[model samples]
Target: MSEQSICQARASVMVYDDTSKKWVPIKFSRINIYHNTASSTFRVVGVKLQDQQVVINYSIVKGLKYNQATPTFHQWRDARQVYGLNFASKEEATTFSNAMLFALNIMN
Candidate 1:
């Protein structure tokens, strides 16, 4: 296999792990993106469970508290938890955001 094929599967976004209680960076294959209407947020759909889907919301991440001394809620889905921010490369972000523009032009 070419050296490129050795790359691990990964997602475009960082994912939060619940069991080990830490964030998991993307590898070769990664979770799929999903939108939740009830919560009106976007989520990263990860492992499949029997009764419920395991997902982490990335939409509407609250701004960091202006003051460090004051305690605030670190919330997720109306619950409090630790969620990290996902940093995208400016080049990647720009191109990804413009995919529709290219798609529309290509389709026509």
Candidate 2:
């Protein structure tokens, strides 16, 4: 078994600022989804501060959803921490979201 990248996109990252109580943009980065077939683990890259990655496990990921109105904006959370991603196109964003959901479902 090997680790494989399922999906990825170039998007602007955003995090919820506790002080300002609003989401603030960080920088443009490439968001990636990786799957480990051996252990059946899914990891997401480019959502954390300082470019950390997140592993999807029990009680690790909070929520993930796509914005129907905006189409290019997507959101996901690590526990209480929230993240927003602005993608290049609706197609990219939507496809990424679907891949995320698939990874999540398999992990659980």
Candidate 3:
């Protein structure tokens, strides 16, 4: 299956959040050019268990945050330039990472 197809399939799986102790649907959407510049402009869209809507932008390299006092919620600072997955739970986060690694390996 193609990367897009795998993404669609992965998106079908509901994400479970341990913190909130609830299951949420993983909705996928395309990022607007103004919001993301990556060639593969797909993103996961959903409201977090906390009711916060998030959009994960994909990038070539991982972005880092360096706030000594208050760390940013996301690993990346520039949303418009990186590839990422947003989730309400750490479980979902791990799943997304594994999926990305699988998909990228297939592509390569």
**Top candidate (TM-score):** 2
After aligning candidate 3 to the native by TM-score, how far in Å is the CA of 89 from where it should be?
0.4
Q: What TM-score would each prediction reach against the true structure? A: 0.25, 0.72, 0.31
Question: Model 1 over residues 4-50: C-alpha lDDT tens digits?
Answer: 11111122333357777776653312233343444533333433233
Q: List, residue by residue over 1-108, the lDDT tens digit for candidate 3.
A: 222423321122234454566645445332221112234433333323344454433332333221111111122234432223333345544544544444334334
- In Å, residue 85's CA in model 2 sits off its true spot by 0.6
Error of 1 at 53 (Å): 11
User: In model 1, what are the clashing residue pairs, if there are any?
Assistant: 8-27, 8-28, 9-27, 9-28, 9-29, 10-27, 10-28, 10-29
Instruction: Provide the overall lDDT of each model, using Cα atoms, as 2-decimal numbers.
Output: 0.32, 0.66, 0.34
Candidate 1 vs candidate 2: the lDDT winner is 2
Q: Model 3, poorest ten-residue lDDT window? A: 65-74
Off by over 4 Å in 1: 1-9, 12-27, 47-60, 64-108
Candidate number of the best lDDT: 2
Cα deviation of 50, candidate 3, in Å: 14
Candidate 2 off by > 4 Å: 47-69
Model 2 poorest ten-residue lDDT run: 53-62
